[PDB]
């Protein structure tokens, strides 16, 4: 099964998932000079005041903070999107070192990590149907740089000891994802894919320009997680990022001048 190692990592995924070489794969490098301001875009509406977090899970690839998506409670609207997208989970990608870890890059710069808030289009009724559609998902991507601590991340960091290994989960109610957002909602957007198998080409990506700052100690605790299950030899969960993929026939649009 797929992973991030030399024998099962990104260069191998195309054998089981041929769409890995498709026309709208993610992530990509965002060339800031080539992206074009689009005055047709609207501000992003991020409405997370009623979000209901439930659980945090180590799935062997990353950890997911899961939300109750049985009602419009935490939704993304506006920007490039038509209609309403419900938050289902967020997770991160990160490196073994502070100079790598993001999936998207900005003028080839790698950030220490990247947060993905995953939302599905409510017109398709749930997530499994949404992933079969070209406009099924919207992923809000936020870069993490190492600097000052992000207070709203600390509850996540402090629960990681309890989900060290693959398949472990813990209650994670009453978490407010508003505390993971930067001040500005300026963004880039393009049509892409999931960055993990099955790599489905269902995503409108919305990548914020402003990174959030996290402390070195916060990201160090991400790097103490394990890819392996309990009782198995320890494999640190680091470098769980897919590199940039060919842009092919796409244009990245900017919401800002």
Q: Which segments are annotated as binding site for Zn(2+)?
A: 91, 93, 116
CA distance 198 to 186: 29
Chain centroid to Cα 246, Å, comes to: 19
Radius of gyration of the chain (CA): 17
Q: Which is nearer to ligand 0VW, 147 or 167 (CB)?
A: 167
Indicate the SS3 state at residue 96.
Answer: coil
Q: How far is the CB of 205 from ligand 0VW (least distance, A)?
A: 8
Which of 102, 165, 196, 226 binds ligand 0VW (CB under 6 A)? It is 196
Q: How far apart are the first and last CA of the chain?
A: 44
Nearby residues of 68 by Cβ (< 8 Å), 6 or more positions away: 52, 53, 54
How does DSSP classify residue 18?
Answer: G
Q: How far is the CB of 39 from ligand 0VW (least distance, A)?
A: 28
Task: Please give the residue whose beta carbon sits closest to ligand 0VW in the complex.
Answer: 194
CA distance 183 to 92: 19
Q: How far is the CB of 194 from Zn ion (least distance, A)?
A: 8
Q: Which residues participate in catalysis according to the annotation?
A: 61
By CB under 6 A, the residues from 136 to 165 that bind ligand 0VW are 139
Q: Which is nearer to ligand 0VW, 116 or 209 (CB)?
A: 116
C-alpha dihedral (24, 56, 149, 74), degrees to nearest 10: 60
* Residues 80-119: x where in contact with ligand 0VW by CB under 6 A, - otherwise, as a string: ------------------------------------x-x-
CB atoms within 10 A of CB 108: 9
| Beta bridge mates, 190 | 205
Is residue 121 within the footprint of ligand 0VW (CB under 6 A)? no
Which one of Zn ion, ligand 0VW, none is in contact with 86 (Cβ closer than 5 to 8 A by kind)? none
Residue 237 burial class via C-beta count within 10 angstroms: exposed 0-12, middle 13-18, buried 19 and up: buried
Which one of ligand 0VW, Zn ion, none is in contact with 194 (Cβ closer than 5 to 8 A by kind)? ligand 0VW
Which one of Zn ion, ligand 0VW, none is in contact with 28 (Cβ closer than 5 to 8 A by kind)? none
Which of 24, 86, 116, 168 binds Zn ion (CB under 5 A)? It is 116
Nearby residues of 40 by Cβ (< 8 Å), 6 or more positions away: none
Mark the segment that binds ligand 0VW (CB under 6 A) among 42-50, 173-181, 188-196, 219-227.
188-196
Mark the segment that binds Zn ion (CB under 5 A) among 116-124, 157-165, 209-217, 233-241.
116-124
Q: Which is nearer to Zn ion, 64 or 84 (CB)?
A: 64
Interacting residues with Zn ion (CB under 5 A): 116
């Amino acid at each position: 099964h797929w992973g991030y190692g030399k024998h099962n990592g990104p260069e191998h995924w195309h054998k089981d998932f041929p769409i890995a070489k498709g026309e709208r794969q993610s992530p990509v490098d965002i060339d800031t000079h080539t992206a074009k301001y689009d005055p047709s875009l609207k501000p992003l509406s991020v409405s997370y005041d009623q979000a209901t977090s439930l659980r945090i899970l180590n799935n062997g690839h990353a950890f997911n903070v899961e939300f109750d998506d049985s009602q419009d409670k935490a939704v993304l609207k506006g920007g490039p999107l038509d209609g309403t997208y419900r938050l289902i989970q967020f997770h991160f990608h990160w490196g073994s070192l502070d100079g790598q870890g993001s999936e998207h890059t900005v003028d080839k710069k790698k950030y220490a990590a990247e947060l993905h808030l995953v939302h599905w289009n409510t017109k398709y009724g749930d997530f499994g149907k949404a992933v079969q559609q070209p406009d099924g998902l919207a992923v809000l991507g936020i870069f993490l740089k190492v600097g000052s601590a992000k207070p709203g991340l600390q509850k996540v960091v402090d629960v990681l000891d309890s989900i060290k290994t693959k398949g472990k989960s813990a209650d994670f109610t009453n978490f407010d994802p508003r505390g993971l957002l930067p001040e500005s909602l300026d963004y880039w957007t393009y049509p892409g894919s999931l960055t993990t198998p099955p790599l489905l080409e269902c995503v409108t990506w919305i990548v914020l320009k402003e990174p959030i700052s996290v402390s070195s100690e916060q990201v160090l605790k991400f790097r103490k997680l394990n890819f392996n299950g309990e009782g198995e030899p320890e494999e640190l969960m680091v470098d769980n990022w897919r590199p940039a993929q060919p842009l092919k026939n796409r244009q990245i649009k900017a919401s800002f001048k």
